[PDB]
Amino acid sequence: GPLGSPLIGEIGPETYSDYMSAGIPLAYIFAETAEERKELSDKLKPIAEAQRGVINFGTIDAKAFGAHAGNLNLKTDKFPAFAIQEVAKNQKFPFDQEKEITFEAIKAFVDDFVAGKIEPSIKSEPIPEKQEG
Numbered sequence: 001g002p003l004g005s006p007l008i009g010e011i012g013p014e015t016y017s018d019y020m021s022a023g024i025p026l027a028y029i030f031a032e033t034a035e036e037r038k039e040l041s042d043k044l045k046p047i048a049e050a051q052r053g054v055i056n057f058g059t060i061d062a063k064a065f066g067a068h069a070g071n072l073n074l075k076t077d078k079f080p081a082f083a084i085q086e087v088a089k090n091q092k093f094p095f096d097q098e099k100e101i102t103f104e105a106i107k108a109f110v111d112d113f114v115a116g117k118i119e120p121s122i123k124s125e126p127i128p129e130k131q132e133g
Contacts, residue, residue, distance in 0.1 A: 005018045005019075007019075007022075007052055007053075007056055007057060008044075008045065008048045008049070008052060008056075008057040008058070009057075009058060009059070010058060010059050010060065010061075011026075011028060011058030011059065011060035011065075012060075012065075015058060016058070016060075019056035019058060019087065020087055022056055022087065023087055023088065024053075024054055024055060024056060024087060024088070025054075025055050025056070025084055025085060025086045025087055025088060025089075025093075025113075025114070026055070026056040026058060026084070026085045026086075026087055027048070027055050027056060027057050027058065027082065027083075027084050027085075027110060028058060028060055028068070028069070028072070028081075028082070028083040028084070028085055028094075029041065029044060029057070029058065029059040029060060029080065029082050029083075029101075030060050030061070030062035030065075030066055030068070030069040030074070030076075030080055030081040030082070030083060031059060031060070031061065031062050031080035031081075032061070032062040032063045032066060032079070032080065033062075033079065033080055036080075037059070037080075040059075040080055040101050041059050043101070043102055043103030043104075043106065044057060044059070044103075044106060046103065047103055047106055047107040047110065048110075050107075051110065051114065054114065055084075055110065055114070056087075062076065062080060062081060066081075069081040069083055069094070069097075072085055072092040072094065073092045073094045073121060073122060073123070074094055074097055075097065076097075077097065078096075078097035078098045079097055079098065079101075080097065080101055081094065081095070081097040082094065082095035082101055082106060082109070083095070084109075084110065084113055084118075091120055091123075092120070092121075092123070093109075093113045093118040093119075093120070093121070094121060095109050
């Protein structure tokens with residue numbers, strides 16, 4: 001059957017819902033780059049192999065479905081945008097689009113995320129005047 005999707009693969013209209021139904025955080029690798037896409041995802045292969053049962057690693061086209069990068073946070077204005085969507089916390093722990101996606105960079109990031117060090121970079125969550133109780 002079509003069950004048991006490649007947890008590290010490409011995110012598309014079929015697969016995104018599965019990663020979202022997995023219950024575990026989804027690492028959205030938006031990439032408008034078709035050339036270095038291979039390299040980008042190639043560093044992503046081992047770093048995600050390390051977390052192949054805990055994070056959904058999906059590479060998504062940032063040119064066709066790139067709008068989604070900032071439906072979660074990013075400005076969609078720059079080079080591949082690595083965005084970690086929480087399927088549990090609904091949070092979005094995304095990486096810079098203007099930094100560098102390497103093996104180490106992403107590894108360190110996802111590591112620092114899953115450990116609990118990465119925090120919501122923005123996300124409008126207002127602090128209103130509350131009362132005593």
